[PDB]
């Protein structure tokens, strides 16, 4: 399948070269998989989600996304126009308030929630979690991410936006999850992207168009935007049967475009997420 005039990041993940604008993908499109977006919520009524999104948990007085960040990330995973995996099921877990903030205790509870809740959901092709959040190093936060992964969920986490080594941030620094840095449309490391040996992969993160609250759209930047590209890619590949939750991060690294990014510090992987789709 081909989506013409797609957001640059979608085109990038199906291309061996920068500078193209069509996204190519197998029409299965992540059907039968599920992606949990652990964030500020998801505006599930957005036409872009087509009934495939639902809120399943909140830790606040409402499950509504009053911020937009979670809705944007969910759109990059799985919206019809802006999403990698256009037929996946999206589940919202609101661990962040409408200012985008959350206590580590709440974030941990949300991860443990997903590890169990996937057993209430029909996800025959597999389960992914997208975590576009983090703060300073916490062994308890890293442990929770490790448990979520161990339970059979492909965990993709943002490296962070400090232009610093991600070893000092959580859950970015948990080795067993998939830690995602950000790139721009010219194949440069995004100016704010964290780096370091803990990174597994880069995805598009600068100037990413996706869904927003109020039934709208906007372009924003962050490792928060790169992470759902990788989460959606994992769901897409799991639906194709090419990999599993336990092996998808390694598979994405194995099949990535290699050596094509600029300003990658020595010791950080030079790997850009790629779907290897051939029509
Ligand atoms: N995808 C590519 O063209 C490429 C270029 C250089 C090294 N590895 C891969």
Q: Number of structural domains, the chain?
A: 1
97 is in an annotated binding site: no
| Closest atom of ligand 1 to CA, residue 16 | 1
Residue 278 lies in a domain: no
DSSP result, 26-44: -TTTTTTEEEEEEES---T
* Whole-angstrom distance, CA of residue 38 vs CA of residue 149: 14
Residue 213 lies in a domain: yes
Residue position matching structure tokens 């639902």: 54
Residue 237 lies in a domain: yes
Residue 262 lies in a domain: yes
Residue 279 lies in a domain: no
Residue 277 lies in a domain: no
Residue position matching structure tokens 């290699």: 258
Give yes or no: 224 in active site. yes
In 174-194, which positions are buried (b, 16+ CB within 10 angstroms) versus exposed (e)? beebbbbbbbbbebbbbebbb
DSSP result, 150-191: HTT-EEEEE--SSSSBGGGEETTT-TTSEEEEEE-TTSBBPT
Tell me the CATH number at 166.
3.40.50.200
**Terminal CA-to-CA distance of the chain, rounded, Å?**
8
* Whole-angstrom distance, CA of residue 218 vs CA of residue 205: 13
How was this model experimentally determined? X-ray
Residues 6+ apart with CB under 8 A from 194: 159, 160, 161, 162, 163, 164, 165, 166, 169, 172, 181, 223
Q: Which of 12, 15, 16 to mutate to test the pocket of ligand 1 (most atoms within 8 A of CB)?
A: 16
Spatial contact of 198 and 175, defined as CB atoms under 8 Å apart: yes
* Whole-angstrom distance, CA of residue 16 vs CA of residue 19: 10
Give yes or no: 254 in active site. no
Give yes or no: 72 in active site. no
Helices 223-239 and 69-78 pack at an angle, to 10 degrees, of 30
State both tokens at 278. Answer: 């051939």
Write out the residue range of the structural domain in which residue 198 sits. Answer: 2-272
What is the distance in A from the centroid of ligand 1 to the CA of 21? 19
223 is in an annotated binding site: no
200 is in an annotated binding site: yes
Report the pocket of ligand 1 as residue ranges, CB < 6 Å: 16, 257-260
Spatial contact of 276 and 13, defined as CB atoms under 8 Å apart: no
What is the distance in A from the centroid of ligand 1 to the CA of 12? 13
* Whole-angstrom distance, CA of residue 193 vs CA of residue 161: 5
User: Omega of the bond prior to 158 within 30 degrees of 0, cis?
Assistant: no
Cα 248 to Cα 107, 118, 145, 237, 260, distances in angstroms:
23, 17, 16, 8, 21
- Strand pairing partners for 178? 156
Give, using CA atoms, the residue closest to atom 3 of ligand 1. 16
Of the candidates 39, 98, 165, 184, the residue annotated as catalytic is 39
| Residue 196 DSSP one-character state | S
| Closest atom of ligand 1 to CA, residue 258 | 8
* Whole-angstrom distance, CA of residue 239 vs CA of residue 47: 23
State both tokens at 19. Answer: 């500078």
- Strand pairing partners for 220? 208
81 is in an annotated binding site: no
* Whole-angstrom distance, CA of residue 273 vs CA of residue 14: 9
Entry resolution (Å)? 1.2
Q: Which of 18, 20, 260 to mutate to test the pocket of ligand 1 (most atoms within 8 A of CB)?
A: 260
């Amino acid at each position: 399948a081909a989506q013409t005039n797609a957001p640059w990041g979608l085109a990038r993940i199906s291309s061996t070269s920068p500078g193209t604008s069509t996204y190519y993908y197998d029409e299965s499109a992540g059907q039968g998989s599920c992606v949990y977006v652990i964030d500020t919520g998801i505006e599930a009524s957005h036409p872009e989600f087509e009934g495939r999104a639902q809120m399943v948990k909140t830790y606040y007085y409402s499950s509504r996304d009053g911020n937009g960040h979670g809705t944007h990330c969910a759109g990059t995973v799985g919206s019809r126009t802006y999403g990698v995996a256009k037929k996946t099921q999206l589940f919202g877990v609101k661990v962040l308030d409408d200012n985008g903030s959350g206590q580590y205790s709440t974030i941990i509870a949300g991860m443990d929630f997903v590890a169990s809740d996937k057993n209430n959901r029909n996800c025959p092709k597999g389960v992914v979690a997208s975590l576009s959040l983090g703060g300073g190093y916490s062994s308890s936060v890293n442990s929770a991410a490790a448990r979520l992964q161990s339970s059979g969920v492909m965990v993709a986490v943002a490296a962070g936006n400090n232009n610093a080594d991600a070893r000092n941030y959580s859950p970015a620094s948990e080795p067993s999850v998939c830690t995602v840095g950000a790139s721009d449309r010219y194949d440069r490391r995004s100016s704010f992207s964290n780096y370091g040996s803990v990174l597994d992969i880069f995805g598009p993160g600068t100037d990413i168009l996706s869904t927003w609250i109020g039934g709208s759209t906007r372009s924003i930047s962050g490792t928060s935007m790169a992470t759902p590209h990788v989460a959606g890619l994992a769901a897409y590949l799991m639906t194709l049967g090419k990999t599993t939750a336990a092996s998808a991060c390694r598979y994405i690294a194995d099949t990535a475009n290699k050596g094509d990014l600029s300003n990658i510090p020595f010791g950080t992987v030079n790997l850009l997420a790629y779907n290897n789709y051939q029509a």
